[PDB]
């Protein structure tokens, strides 16, 4: 288990955008027309403003950033809204659930981008 997380850690930093989040939000907001994922990141609003489930939003938001070319867990995390389950939880459950969503999200996009 632990060794599989270190294998994921090296894979993300190898596929990361290598650019700071302050630059990422510029490319995020000019690479797509109006969209649910764009509404969250380009206006700093929260899931309750778009009336979506916080766990469902965390899925589509995380998979989208990976397709944008950014994959560092600190960049993906920093762009999540206030109501994110990966930002508001029992603290210890925050880090646990974040990796469960991050590891499965990266699994779906990496098999999709290498297709």
How is the secondary structure organized here?
Layout: H1 2-15, H2 21-30, H3 36-41, H4 54-68, H5 73-78, H6 92-113
Helix pairs in contact: 4-6
Please name the defining characteristics of this protein.
transferase, mainly alpha, globular, functional pRN1 primase, SF3 helicase domain-containing protein, replication initiation, 6 helices
Range of helix content: 55-70%
> Helical segment tally?
6
- Write the element-wise H/E pattern from the N-terminal end onward: HHHHHH
How is the CATH topology named?
Methyltransferase, Methionine Synthase (B12-binding Domains), Chain A, domain 1
Shape: globular
Structural class label: mainly alpha
Write down the domain tally.
Answer: 1
Biggest beta sheet summary: none
- Alpha carbon gyration radius: 14 Å
Number of strands: 0
The separation of the N and C termini measures 26 Å
Which architecture name does CATH use? Orthogonal Bundle
The quaternary structure here is: monomer
Strand content: under 5%
CATH class: Mainly Alpha
Organism: Saccharolobus islandicus
Disulfide bonds: 29-42
Protein name: SF3 helicase domain-containing protein
